[PDB]
Amino acid sequence: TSQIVLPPHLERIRERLAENIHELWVMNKIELGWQYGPVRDDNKRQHPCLVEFCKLPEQERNYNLQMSLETLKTLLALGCHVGIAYQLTSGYKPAPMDLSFIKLTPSQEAMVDKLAENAHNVWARDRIRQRRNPRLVPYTLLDDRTKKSNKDSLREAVRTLLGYG
């Protein structure tokens, strides 16, 4: 996917998608019960990466930026053209719109599955250096119980792409 030049015309759309991914990364942790704290911990139910998109440093925004870039690059490599078409938290208000209403087409579901497959392949390539974790197998040879979580995590990219116009 990295062999594709990213069109600057959709750079703002990519940044918006990264912001949406980040705010989802906030909401899921908050639903789990996570607040905003200065310590990067998982058992203490706090996360220092729940602050506004503008206040995010380069040490915290690059992850969502890169997910947006790789999602759009993977879509372009697949072939479909890309172009023009509440719980009270501890400081952040992630709620762009109601993006869970329009039915996602089977084609877009398949593309979301392809994005999940690509992400899992990259993660497995990273993880083969560690032993013998059972998840080192490709996404096709993976257990079907955890496939839906990754597919849902990758669906919101195309969801935002369709909703934003």
Curated annotation (Swiss-Prot):
The chain holds residues 869 to 1061 of 4966 of the full protein. Homotetramer. Can also form heterotetramers with RYR1 and RYR3. Interacts with CALM and S100A1; these interactions regulate channel activity. Identified in a complex composed of RYR2, FKBP1B, PKA catalytic subunit, PRKAR2A, AKAP6, and the protein phosphatases PP2A and PP1. Interacts directly with FKBP1B, PKA, PP1 and PP2A. Interacts with FKBP1A and FKBP1B; these interactions may stabilize the channel in its closed state and prevent Ca(2+) leaks. Interacts with SELENON. Identified in a complex, composed of FSD2, CMYA5 and RYR2. Highly expressed in heart, lung, cerebellum and brain. Detected at lower levels in adrenal gland, stomach, thymus, esophagus and ovary. Disulfide bonds: none annotated. Coiled coil: none annotated. This is Ryanodine receptor 2. The calcium release channel activity resides in the C-terminal region while the remaining part of the protein resides in the cytoplasm. It comes from Mus musculus (Mouse). It is found in: Sarcoplasmic reticulum membrane. Channel activity is modulated by phosphorylation. Phosphorylation is increased in failing heart, leading to calcium leaks and increased cytoplasmic Ca(2+) levels. Belongs to the ryanodine receptor (TC 1.A.3.1) family. RYR2 subfamily. Sequence repeats lie at residues 1-85, 86-165. The lineage of its organism: Eukaryota, Metazoa, Chordata, Craniata, Vertebrata. Disruption phenotype: Embryonically lethal. Embryos die at about 10 dpc, due to defects in heart tube development. Cardiac myotubes display enlarged rough endoplasmic reticulum and cytoplasmic vesicles that contain high levels of Ca(2+). It comes from the Eukaryota. Cytosolic calcium-activated calcium channel that mediates the release of Ca(2+) from the sarcoplasmic reticulum into the cytosol and thereby plays a key role in triggering cardiac muscle contraction. Aberrant channel activation can lead to cardiac arrhythmia. In cardiac myocytes, calcium release is triggered by increased Ca(2+) cytosolic levels due to activation of the L-type calcium channel CACNA1C. The calcium channel activity is modulated by formation of heterotetramers with RYR3. Required for cellular calcium ion homeostasis. Required for embryonic heart development.
